[PDB]
Amino acid sequence: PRFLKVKNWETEVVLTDTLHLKSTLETGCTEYICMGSIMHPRPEDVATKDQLFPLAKEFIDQYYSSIKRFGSKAHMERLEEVNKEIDTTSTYQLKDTELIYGAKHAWRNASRCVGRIQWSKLQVFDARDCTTAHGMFNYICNHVKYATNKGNLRSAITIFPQRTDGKHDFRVWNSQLIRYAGYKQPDGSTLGDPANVQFTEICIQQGWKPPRGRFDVLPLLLQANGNDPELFQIPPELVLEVPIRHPKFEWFKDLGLKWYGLPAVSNMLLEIGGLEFSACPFSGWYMGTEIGVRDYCDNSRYNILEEVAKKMNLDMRKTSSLWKDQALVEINIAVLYSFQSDKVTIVDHHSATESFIKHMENEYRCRGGCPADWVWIVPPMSGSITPVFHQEMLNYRLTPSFEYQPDPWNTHVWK
Amino acid sequence: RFLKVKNWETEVVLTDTLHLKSTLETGCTEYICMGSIMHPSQHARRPEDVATKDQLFPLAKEFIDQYYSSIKRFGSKAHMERLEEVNKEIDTTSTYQLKDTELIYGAKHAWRNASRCVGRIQWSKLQVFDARDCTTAHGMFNYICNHVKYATNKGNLRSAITIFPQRTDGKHDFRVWNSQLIRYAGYKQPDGSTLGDPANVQFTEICIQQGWKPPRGRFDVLPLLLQANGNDPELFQIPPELVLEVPIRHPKFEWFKDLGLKWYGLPAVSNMLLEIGGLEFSACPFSGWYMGTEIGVRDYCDNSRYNILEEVAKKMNLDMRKTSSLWKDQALVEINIAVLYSFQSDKVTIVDHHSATESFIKHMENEYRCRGGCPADWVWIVPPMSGSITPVFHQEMLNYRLTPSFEYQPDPWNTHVWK
Ligand code: HEM
Ligand code: HEM
Ligand SMILES: CNCc1cc(-c2cc(C)cc(N)n2)cc(C(F)(F)F)c1
Ligand SMILES: CNCc1cc(-c2cc(C)cc(N)n2)cc(C(F)(F)F)c1
Ligand SMILES: C[C@H](O)[C@H](O)[C@H]1CNc2nc(N)[nH]c(=O)c2N1
Ligand SMILES: C[C@H](O)[C@H](O)[C@H]1CNc2nc(N)[nH]c(=O)c2N1
Ligand SMILES: [Zn+2]
């Protein structure tokens, strides 16, 4: 249209979205069916010259508008300069300012991220000169060290060279920089994180010597210039971990639970002006429920509800005792208490969602909207006692963006 | 063209063709998703007031076709005569009348098609009370009382809908002004706070402004405000012996009962519009039984509702200085334990969000297997607490609009011209 309205049914606040008119890529929905809850709606899908020109123009135009230099001499020469590169080299190179701007705005545009109030405080590490897996390891270690900051976590991203022909991609094969291994046992059981069973097998196959324990930090599996990925052990002093204890339940520490302090997504693709940065690990800090609800309590994950409820002496014979709900809360209290006690940055789902509402309202004020994916923004527990549950949100895809990409081991041509 | 939904816990993939029969816009486009907009679309199947023939007949034909298709006629003698009967009726009244079988089919299928309803595994077990002979608010009150008594069934709740006369010209609407048949009053206090149910403050004020004598308590069952044939609405007190209530106590916290909380047993939505073959049934109160989280999470713990979280947390002796103590989450669980314990103790039908969502997954698989799909609104189906430890959270869903359907409609006091 030219205006869309979103209402908060708790506060009655109504905001007007004009920004959705600038959307240029599909949500997955059609006019007659909504695919809002679908999680994911060839490597040679590299953009041609003619495809790249308007994408580049759009981004450069966006960047020069953002800095109030639209139409300027430097805006027109940059456009001419980009077009020359696309003409001659079939691609182009972002200036450092553009790269920073692009990476920050991909975060700003990530409709599934509840932590976007921080988007403009992002530390961008330019790793576009990297050429080997050893180099990538170095950049990633410096990233982890900077981001962890002895527990006072700082959001950061490290951007490796962009895709060229799709045959020389840089990839972190890890889904996060720090995750725990998972081992399927012969008896069907799983040790460690079941989500990482296949990637653990890949590592072991590449030569990793697994400790075979419940909380083994995985090695990095790093791929530079489309070569076979190489294994690297993150220095253990760089991996900040928090042992999980409960403020009231003495026995909780006896579950032997711990988690890492630094959530660092490493398998997504950063798209800026048609350029595809296939390796761009970014990191922030945790919302407690990511660990306490999903990592610990998903049936497919560590799946500790039964253990915690047993220790809590809960009546587990029928679902209506809500024993799962009761143990879920205590687990999440323990995660928060533990990070806070160890002075490792964390945010609880109540603070995060309240902050996101403030962020959303500010984005509407200054930007004309804030794309938001309700299905992901609402925390995985206690949904409606958080303010975002009652917040209408419009979802739409702006670029620069973070995009999913196939797991590398499905498409990699081994040398 | 033919869409798959995956459950990320089980890796069960379902393949949806039923969406190809969807008629109305969701509100989304290829470029915007309105999945969390409460009312994303005003796309209606028929225009403002009484449709012309070329507007109403095609809708009628489509529903009659669907009904006779459903019973493995289609083109049968009775189907073709029905089309001519509907055709003649629209020619001579600008509307048409549903047979009892069509009405029952339509009501059950509007429920079957309600993408936001997690209870739909019961859809074909629906008692339909035909009230299309009703002419006055007194008659509506009589019909609603019978509905309430039948549906309540001394605590063994039974799904029911009562269907009053369809809209004719729009000036003669039958409306239940209550949003549910049984809700508690909300009172605006002189000191600015609110007593009772804040959602119902405005409707409570209409009732008082209509002559209702509020007892001014926290659990005052609202009177019925019934409108028949476009006339001014009339107040009626539901006989309290028909209004089953459950005192809320806790199986461990002996002090919980001293909070003086209760809730009613029967959720009976009464402000929605039932749409069948272009017919608009503007008064179609329907009821089932509660999912515990509707009372314990939304009714009791929404900020602009009863908001009893601090009260319960205080009794539980929780650290309420910061959020990260998760004191709201702890009290929230205890309230929902209490709600379930209270209803089950009093042998009043209720379902917890774990079993209700599990049944819905089973309903989805049934529907894909026999019907080629099942429209489902994830935003509404996932419960308001402990989302991801329920299976629906991990279930991709396709949302699309099938007819017959339940629709929202304006609150009649924004519309009604008094006399
Ligand atoms: C700084 C603190 C941050 C917090 C508390 C936070 C919180 C979250 C949470 C809870 C999720 C959902 C994760 C899940 O449920 O699996 C998420 C998703 C996401 N975050 Fe953030 N985040 C933060 C920082 C960042 C940063 C620094 C970036 C990028 C530079 C980022 C980009 C994203 C993206 C792209 C997604 C969703 C990916 C998708 O589309 O599925 N976030 N965030
Ligand atoms: C019998 C047990 C039933 C259960 C457990 C159940 C459960 C629910 C719940 C929890 C909701 C969401 C309500 C809210 O969050 O405010 C809902 C919505 C709904 N229910 Fe059911 N329900 C049942 C029966 C019925 C019946 C008998 C009908 C109609 C004949 C019906 C029609 C609907 C509709 C149309 C909606 C969505 C209304 C909208 O679009 O806003 N339900 N149901
Ligand atoms: C259970 N969390 C796993 C997970 C966590 C995060 C995430 C990312 C960042 C930067 C911060 C944070 N706090 N979380 C992002 C994703 C994904 F893949 F969706 F982007 C998944
Ligand atoms: C939070 N309760 C309010 C509410 C309850 C229900 C509802 C309806 C039925 C038949 C059963 C049930 N268990 N619930 C339906 C709605 C609405 F408006 F969406 F249709 C709202
Ligand atoms: C099927 C559904 O889309 C899927 O389970 C989603 C639900 N919402 C989510 N929300 C967040 N934050 N993270 C998730 O992984 C998911 N998974
Ligand atoms: C903004 C959002 O769509 C709105 O608050 C919805 C969210 N999901 C819901 N889900 C249910 N079951 N009931 C509701 O009232 C709502 N409210
Ligand atoms: Zn949509």
Strands A258-260 and B405-407: unpaired
Domain that holds residue A176: 129-154+169-240+404-408
Tokens of A290: 């990511």
Give every CB contact of residue B11 below 8 A, 6+ residues apart in sequence: none
Q: Is A323 annotated as a binding residue?
A: no
Q: Is the dihedral of CA A60, A61, A65, A66 positive or negative?
A: negative
For residue B328, the chain A residues in CB contact (below 8 A) are 350, 382, 385
What gap in Å lies between CA B124 and CA B109, rounded to an integer? Answer: 8
DSSP codes joined into one string, B152-184: HGGGS---EEEEPPPPSSSSS--EE-SSBSS-B
- Residues B392, B378 contacting (CB under 8 angstroms): yes
For ligand 7, an ion, list residues with CB under 5 A.
A 29, 34, 36; B 28, 33, 35
Assigned domain for B399 exists: no
Do A295 and A359 belong together in one domain?
no
What gap in Å lies between CA A386 and CA A390, rounded to an integer? Answer: 8
Q: If you count them, how many residues does chain B have?
A: 419
What gap in Å lies between CA B87 and CA B117, rounded to an integer? Answer: 34
3-state helix vs strand vs coil in chain A, percent to 5: 40, 15, 45
Atom of ligand 5 nearest to the CA of A39: 3
What gap in Å lies between CA A292 and CA B77, rounded to an integer? Answer: 63
Nearest to A143 by CA among A299, A233, A264: A264
What gap in Å lies between CA B39 and CA B48, rounded to an integer? Answer: 18
Tokens 């225009």, residue located: B47
Q: Does an H or E element contain B395, and which?
A: none
Phi, psi (degrees; rounded to nearest 5) at B329: -65, -35
Reduced to 3 states (helix: H, G, I; strand: E, B; else coil), residue B326 is: coil
Q: What is the residue type of A273?
A: G
Assigned domain for B297 exists: yes
Reduced to 3 states (helix: H, G, I; strand: E, B; else coil), residue A147 is: helix
Q: What is the residue type of B211?
A: G
Instruction: List strand residue ranges (DSSP E) for B69-140, in order.
Output: 127-130
What gap in Å lies between CA A133 and CA A15, rounded to an integer? Answer: 47
Q: List the Cα angle A347/A353/A354 in 5-degree steps.
A: 100
Q: Is A278 annotated as a binding residue?
A: no
Do A196 and A276 belong together in one domain?
no
Q: Is cis: bond before B267, omega within 30 of 0?
A: no
Taking each helix axis from N to C terminus, what angle separates B77-93 and B53-70, rounded to the nearest 10 degrees? 160
Q: List the Cα angle A238/A243/A249 in 5-degree steps.
A: 170
Give the resolution to one decimal, in Å. Answer: 1.9
Asked how this structure was determined, the answer is X-ray
CA atoms within 13 Å, Cβ hemisphere of B213: 0
C-alpha to C-alpha distances, B368 to A29, A201, A384, nearest whole angstrom = 20, 35, 30
Q: How far is CA B154 from the centre of its chain?
A: 21
Assigned domain for B391 exists: no
Do A150 and A256 belong together in one domain?
no
Assigned domain for B395 exists: no
What gap in Å lies between CA A158 and CA A279, rounded to an integer? Answer: 8
Q: List the Cα angle B155/B159/B165 in 5-degree steps.
A: 125
Do A233 and A358 belong together in one domain?
no
Reduced to 3 states (helix: H, G, I; strand: E, B; else coil), residue B110 is: helix
Do A32 and A59 belong together in one domain?
yes
- Residues B144, B162 contacting (CB under 8 angstroms): yes
3-state helix vs strand vs coil in chain B, percent to 5: 40, 15, 45
Reduced to 3 states (helix: H, G, I; strand: E, B; else coil), residue B229 is: coil
Measure B384 CA to nearest chain A CA, in Å: 5
For residue B354, the chain A residues in CB contact (below 8 A) are 319-320, 322, 324
What gap in Å lies between CA B283 and CA B129, rounded to an integer? Answer: 12
Do A276 and A334 belong together in one domain?
no
Give every CB contact of residue A241 below 8 A, 6+ residues apart in sequence: A215, A258, A259, A260, A261
Q: List the Cα angle B236/B295/B207 in 5-degree steps.
A: 25
Do B40 and B111 belong together in one domain?
yes
User: Could you count the other beta carbons within 10 Å of the beta carbon of residue A64?
Assistant: 19
What gap in Å lies between CA A57 and CA B158, rounded to an integer? Answer: 63
C-alpha to C-alpha distances, B305 to A374, A407, B183, nearest whole angstrom = 22, 46, 12
What gap in Å lies between CA B129 and CA B149, rounded to an integer? Answer: 12
Do B297 and B218 belong together in one domain?
no
Reduced to 3 states (helix: H, G, I; strand: E, B; else coil), residue B311 is: helix
- Residues B3, B398 contacting (CB under 8 angstroms): yes
Give every CB contact of residue A26 below 8 A, 6+ residues apart in sequence: A41, A397, B30, B31
Tokens of B299: 């009714």
Phi, psi (degrees; rounded to nearest 5) at A367: -120, -15
Ligand 1 is surrounded, with C-beta below 6 A, by A 107, 110, 112-115, 118, 122, 155, 157, 282, 284-285, 287, 290, 347, 352, 376, 402
Reduced to 3 states (helix: H, G, I; strand: E, B; else coil), residue B351 is: strand
Tokens 């199947």, residue located: B45
- Residues A331, A304 contacting (CB under 8 angstroms): yes
Q: Which positions of A are catalytic?
A: 113, 116, 285, 290
Q: What is the residue type of A211?
A: P
DSSP state of B419: -
Give every CB contact of residue B88 below 8 A, 6+ residues apart in sequence: none
Reduced to 3 states (helix: H, G, I; strand: E, B; else coil), residue B57 is: helix
Q: Which residues pair with A125 in a beta bridge?
A: A158
What gap in Å lies between CA B189 and CA B74, rounded to an integer? Answer: 60
Tokens of B284: 């179609």
Q: List the Cα angle B122/B124/B126 in 5-degree steps.
A: 80
Tokens of A321: 């005792």
Whole-angstrom Cα Rg for chain A: 22
- Residues A384, B297 contacting (CB under 8 angstroms): yes
* Contact state of B396 with A37 under an 8 Å Cβ cutoff: yes
DSSP state of A286: E
Whole-angstrom Cα Rg for chain B: 22
Q: List the Cα angle B376/B381/B386 in 5-degree steps.
A: 150
What gap in Å lies between CA A157 and CA A140, rounded to an integer? Answer: 9
- Residues B340, A47 contacting (CB under 8 angstroms): no
Nearest to A174 by CA among A199, A143, A211, A137: A199
Nearest to A105 by CA among A379, A363, A409, A365: A363
What gap in Å lies between CA A323 and CA A308, rounded to an integer? Answer: 10
Using CA atoms of B379, B383, B389, B394 in order, give the dihedral in degrees to the nearest 10.
-20
Reduced to 3 states (helix: H, G, I; strand: E, B; else coil), residue A22 is: helix
Assigned domain for A218 exists: yes
Q: Is cis: bond before B404, omega within 30 of 0?
A: yes
- Judged by a CB distance cut-off of 8 A, whether residue B393 touches chain A is yes
Tokens of A99: 């790269």
Give every CB contact of residue A372 below 8 A, 6+ residues apart in sequence: A111, A356, A360, A391, A393, A394, A395
What burial letters (b/e) apply to A168-204, b meaning 16+ CB within 10 Å? ebbbbbbbbbbbbbbbeeeeeebbbbbbbbebbbbbb
Q: How many domains is chain B built from? A: 3
What gap in Å lies between CA A94 and CA A161, rounded to an integer? Answer: 11
What burial letters (b/e) apply to B285-317, b meaning 16+ CB within 10 Å? bbbbbbbbbbbbbbbbbbeebbebbeebbebee
DSSP state of B17: -
Q: Does an H or E element contain A15, and which?
A: strand A14-17
Assigned domain for A4 exists: no
Phi, psi (degrees; rounded to nearest 5) at A217: -65, 130
C-alpha to C-alpha distances, B212 to A41, A59, A386, B271, nearest whole angstrom = 53, 63, 36, 20
Phi, psi (degrees; rounded to nearest 5) at A389: -60, -35
Tokens 């929605």, residue located: B272
- Judged by a CB distance cut-off of 8 A, whether residue B349 touches chain A is no
What gap in Å lies between CA A352 and CA A288, rounded to an integer? Answer: 10
DSSP state of B138: H
Strands A123-126 and A156-159: parallel
What gap in Å lies between CA A62 and CA A54, rounded to an integer? Answer: 12
Ligand 5 is surrounded, with C-beta below 6 A, by A 37, 39, 375-376; B 8, 393-396
- Residues A313, A219 contacting (CB under 8 angstroms): no
Strands A220-223 and A230-232: antiparallel
C-alpha to C-alpha distances, A314 to A283, A309, A373, B146, B351, nearest whole angstrom = 37, 5, 35, 42, 20
Phi, psi (degrees; rounded to nearest 5) at B392: -70, -30
Q: Does an H or E element contain A325, and which?
A: helix A323-341
DSSP state of A143: H
Assigned domain for A395 exists: no
Tokens of A2: 């030219």
What gap in Å lies between CA B368 and CA B16, rounded to an integer? Answer: 7
What gap in Å lies between CA B325 and CA B313, rounded to an integer? Answer: 11
Do B211 and B251 belong together in one domain?
no
- Residues A284, A263 contacting (CB under 8 angstroms): yes
Q: List the Cα angle B306/B412/B205 in 5-degree steps.
A: 45
- Residues B36, B28 contacting (CB under 8 angstroms): no
- Residues A336, A74 contacting (CB under 8 angstroms): no
DSSP codes joined into one string, A201-219: HHHHHTT-----STTPBPP
DSSP state of B38: S
Tokens of A278: 């296939």
Assigned domain for B4 exists: no
Ligand 3 contact, A287 CB (< 6 A): yes
Q: Which residues pair with A347 in a beta bridge?
A: A287
- Residues B403, B45 contacting (CB under 8 angstroms): yes
DSSP state of B385: S
Nearest to B262 by CA among B186, B331, B196, B201: B196
DSSP state of A32: S
Phi, psi (degrees; rounded to nearest 5) at B37: -85, 130
Nearest to B412 by CA among B284, B272, B236: B272
Do B219 and B319 belong together in one domain?
no
DSSP state of A74: H
Q: If you count them, how many residues does chain A have?
A: 415
What gap in Å lies between CA A107 and CA A118, rounded to an integer? Answer: 9
Tokens of A28: 């997955």
A52 burial via Cβ count (<10 Å: 0-12, 13-18, 19+): buried
Do B66 and B27 belong together in one domain?
yes
Taking each helix axis from N to C terminus, what angle separates A96-108 and A49-66, rounded to the nearest 10 degrees? 90
Nearest to B279 by CA among B75, B98, B40: B98
What gap in Å lies between CA B71 and CA B59, rounded to an integer? Answer: 19
Do B87 and B229 belong together in one domain?
no
What gap in Å lies between CA B326 and CA B320, rounded to an integer? Answer: 8
What gap in Å lies between CA B102 and CA B86, rounded to an integer? Answer: 12
What gap in Å lies between CA A161 and CA A91, rounded to an integer? Answer: 12
C-alpha to C-alpha distances, B59 to A176, B54, B66, B95, B97, nearest whole angstrom = 53, 9, 11, 11, 13
Q: Is the dihedral of CA A190, A194, A196, A198 positive or negative?
A: positive
Atom of ligand 1 nearest to the CA of A403: 40
C-alpha to C-alpha distances, B136 to B131, B174, B230, B297, nearest whole angstrom = 11, 9, 10, 37
CA atoms within 13 Å, Cβ hemisphere of B317: 3
Q: What is the residue type of B98?
A: L
* Contact state of B38 with A392 under an 8 Å Cβ cutoff: yes
Nearest to B38 by CA among B283, B377, B301: B377
- Judged by a CB distance cut-off of 8 A, whether residue A27 touches chain B is yes
- Residues B187, B201 contacting (CB under 8 angstroms): yes
* Contact state of B329 with A294 under an 8 Å Cβ cutoff: no
Strands B290-291 and B350-351: parallel
Reduced to 3 states (helix: H, G, I; strand: E, B; else coil), residue B35 is: coil
Q: What is the residue type of A109?
A: N
Strands B262-264 and A264-265: unpaired
DSSP codes joined into one string, B233-291: PEEEPPPGGGS-EEE---SS-GGGGGG--EEES--EE-S-EEEETTEEES---EE--EE
